[PDB]
Amino acid sequence: SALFEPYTLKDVTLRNRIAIPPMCQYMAEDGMINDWHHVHLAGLARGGAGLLVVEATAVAPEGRITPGCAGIWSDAHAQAFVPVVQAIKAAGSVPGIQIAHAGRKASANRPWEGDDHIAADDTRGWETIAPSAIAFGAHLPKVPREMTLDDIARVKQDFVDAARRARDAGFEWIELHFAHGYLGQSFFSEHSNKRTDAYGGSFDNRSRFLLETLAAVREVWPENLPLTARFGVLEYDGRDEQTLEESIELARRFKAGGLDLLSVSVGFTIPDTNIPWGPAFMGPIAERVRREAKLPVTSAWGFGTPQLAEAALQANQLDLVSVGRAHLADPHWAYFAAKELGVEKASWTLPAPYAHWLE
Amino acid sequence: SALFEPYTLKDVTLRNRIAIPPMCQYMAEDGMINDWHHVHLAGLARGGAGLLVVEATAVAPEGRITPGCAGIWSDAHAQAFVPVVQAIKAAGSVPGIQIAHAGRKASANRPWEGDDHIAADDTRGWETIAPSAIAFGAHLPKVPREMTLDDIARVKQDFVDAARRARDAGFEWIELHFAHGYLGQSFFSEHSNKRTDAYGGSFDNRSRFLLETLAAVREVWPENLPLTARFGVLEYDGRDEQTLEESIELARRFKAGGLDLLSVSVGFTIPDTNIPWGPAFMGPIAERVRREAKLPVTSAWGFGTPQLAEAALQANQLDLVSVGRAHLADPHWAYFAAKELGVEKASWTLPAPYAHWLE
Ligand SMILES: Cc1cc2nc3c(=O)[nH]c(=O)nc-3n(C[C@H](O)[C@H](O)[C@H](O)COP(=O)(O)O)c2cc1C
Ligand SMILES: Cc1cc2nc3c(=O)[nH]c(=O)nc-3n(C[C@H](O)[C@H](O)[C@H](O)COP(=O)(O)O)c2cc1C
Ligand SMILES: O=c1ccc2ccccc2o1
Ligand SMILES: O=c1ccc2ccccc2o1
Ligand SMILES: O=c1ccc2ccccc2o1
Ligand SMILES: O=c1ccc2ccccc2o1
C-alpha cells in the first residue's frame, strides 16, 4: 500500500507515509516538558509512524499558547528534549518538532480549563504581542500589543535560537508554525495585520516576517535535514480565492527559500468563518498547493480512516498523511492501518515484544 | 457496566475491573529493566486499566525464563522499578508485579529467537533447577538438576527478598508465579515432581513448596496490600478431574494462608496435552475455583472482546478480567472497551490531554 512506502526528504528516510502532526499536551511547567511527554512521545514512536512531530514548542515565554505549553527558549529547555528525541530514534521513527509563537492567541487557558484568554488578574497570564493591536474576538478578547521593529528582530532571533537548539537536541525534522492564527499567520493575514511599515500592507510586506524568519532559521538548520512549515492557506472567510492565490505565491517563495515540505492547513485567523469540516476535506486544497507551488505537502483532519489516507496518497494529493486524534485514541494506529490496508506482516509495524504475539 | 465498577481488595481500590496480566517483554539486560519497560508500563497505566501487573520478574538469575527477562534479585534491580512504579501510580492505575522462578523451563531463547532451550555452549545459558531431574521435552529438552533441601531453602528466601523489594519499590499488589510449568507449578505436579522427601509424593508434600513460599512471603508483604498468586489448576492431560480437585483444595489452603485473590490458569507442566483454546474458555473453570474455594479470582485468554469481559463479570465467573494481547495491540484498550460497553464519558477513561479531544 502507498501509506506504507518509505519517503526520503533530504538525508532523512521515513519508514512509511504516516506522520503524527504536532499535538499540544498542555502538560509542561514553565515550558519544561516532563515524563508525560516522554512516555507519550516514545509510546507513539513505537506505534509505527514514520514521523513524529512534537507539539507546538514556544520560542519565547510569551509565545506559549497556555501555561502548560512546551518551550525551548533556553538551553535547559532544549536539554529536556534530548532523552525524548533519543527514545523516538530508538523506536525507528523520525523525531521532528514544531517551533512556534502564539501571538495574539497566547496567554490562554488550557482547553479543558476554559480555553479562553486568561483573566488580567490571574498570576499565570501575560501580555500578548502581535502585528497590530487588534483582538481575535470571541473567547480570545485580549487586545495584543503592537510589535516594535525590535520586537520583530527579537522574535526572529528566538526562532533561530529555537531551531539551533532543536538541531543540537537531535531533532531531524523542523516545522515552523506559521498557521492557525498565531504570530506567523497573523503577519500574513490582512485581518490581523494593519501595519504600515515594512511588515504590513502589501503582499511583500505581509510576507516579510515569515520569509525573514525562514531565512534566518535556514542559517542554523542543517541543509541535510527537512526544513518545513505549517501554513494556513485559506480562512473560509469569503475571501478564499484571493487568499489562496497569495498563499500559493508565498508557498512558491518558501520553496525558493529552501522549504522542503509544507504542512497545509486553515488560517483560523479570525472567528467569523464557515469551515466545511469533513473527512479528508483538506485533500483538494492541499493538492492544489502541491501542484501550483510544486512542493511536497501533508495535511490533516479525518485521515484516521486508513482507506482515506491511502486514497489521498494514491491520488497524489499528499506526500505524507498526518493523523492526529486517532493516535491519541490508539497510539498503535499505524498497526491498525497496516491490518486495514492488508499490509504483509502487519504486526511487525510494531516492535518485536508486541509483533511476535499479534501476527 | 460491570467492567467499569471499582474493586476494593484489602486497602487497595482499582478504578475498574480491567487487569493487565503479567506479560514478559524479553527486553531486560542481566535482569535490569530499562526505558523499554518504563514507557511500555507507563503507557499502559495511562490507558485506563485499574490494575497493571508487571511481567514475570525472576527472584534469582537462574530463575529467569530467558536472557531478556526482568529480575529483582538485588536491591539495584529493585531500584530500577521505582520510577516505573511511580509513573504507574501517577496514571491512577495500581502497580502490581509477578515474581517468579522458571524452574526447568529456564535458560531458554526469546520467543522470536528460537523459543527453545539455549545450547549448552552458548555463553548466555545456565543450569536449570527443578524438583526432579526430568525434562519438559519438546522444545525444552534440557534436563534440570534436582534441587537439594538447601536449594529449596534458598529459593524460598529469594521469593521473600523479592517480595520485600517489591514492597519497598512501591508495588501495591504482588502475584506469586505458581503457574505455567515453572518452579512452583512443577512442585505441585506429579508429572514433574518425583521426589520422595518432604517435598514430593503426597498432596501435602507436593503442596509444601508453594505453601511455605506463600507463608514466607506473607511475613514481609504488607497485610493491607493484596497478596495473590497465579496457579494452573488443570493440565488438559486426561487427569483433569483428579487434578482440579487437588488444585481447588490447594486454593483453599492458599486462602486460609492469607491469599486474597487467585489468578486461575492452566498448568503447561508437560507438552503432551489437548487444551481447548477458545474465547473466554477459562470462564467455567475459574468460576468453579471461585465457588469451591470461596476465593476471588481472575483469569485470561480472549477477553479482549469487551462484551465477553462484561459477561464474565455479570455471571460472577470472575472478579477481575485480565486482558493481555489486546493491550499490546492497543495500549488504550480500556477506552475502546468503555465505548463498546456504552460507558458514560467513555473518553475520560483516559487522561485529560487525550480525553478532551475524543469525547
Ligand atoms: C490535542 C490536540 C493538540 C493539537 N496541537 C497542535 C499543535 O501544537 N500545532 C499545530 O499546528 N496543530 C495542532 N493540532 C491540530 C492537529 O495537528 C491536526 O491538524 C488536527 O487534529 C486534525 O487532524 P486529526 O483529524 O487527525 O486529528 C492539535 C489537535 C488536537 C486535537
Ligand atoms: C508477550 C506475552 C508475555 C506473557 N508473559 C507472562 C508472564 O510473564 N507471566 C504469566 O503468568 N503469564 C504471561 N503471559 C500469558 C498472559 O498473562 C495471558 O494470560 C495470556 O496472554 C492470555 O490472555 P490474552 O488472550 O488476553 O492475551 C504472556 C502472554 C504474551 C502474549
Ligand atoms: O521500537 C523499539 C525497538 C527496540 C527498543 C529498545 C529500547 C527502547 C525503545 C525501543 O523501541
Ligand atoms: O496550532 C494549534 C495548537 C493547539 C491546538 C489545539 C486544538 C486544536 C488545534 C490546535 O492547533
Ligand atoms: O494519567 C495521568 C494524568 C496525569 C499525569 C501527570 C504526569 C505523569 C503521568 C500522568 O498520568
Ligand atoms: O508465564 C509465562 C511467561 C511467558 C509467556 C510467554 C508467552 C505465553 C505465555 C507465557 O507465560
Side-chain angles (χ1 to χ4, degrees), chain A residues 27 29 34-37 39, chain B residues 15 42 45-47 86-93 349-353:
Chain A
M27 289 294 278
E29 291 170 47
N34 48 64
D35 203 46
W36 169 267
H37 312 77
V39 171
Chain B
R15 60 190 168 196
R46 296 173 185 188
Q86 280 159 17
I88 294 172
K89 290 184 179 182
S93 188
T349 291
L350 302 170

Side-chain angles (χ1 to χ4, degrees), chain B residues 176-191:
Chain B
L176 305 183
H177 201 349
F178 294 157
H180 304 170
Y182 299 123
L183 198 59
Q185 186 83 57
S186 68
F187 263 102
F188 191 67
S189 177
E190 286 180 289
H191 284 292

Side-chain angles (χ1 to χ4, degrees), chain A residues 254 273 284 345:
Chain A
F254 284 159
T273 60
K345 299 180 180 180

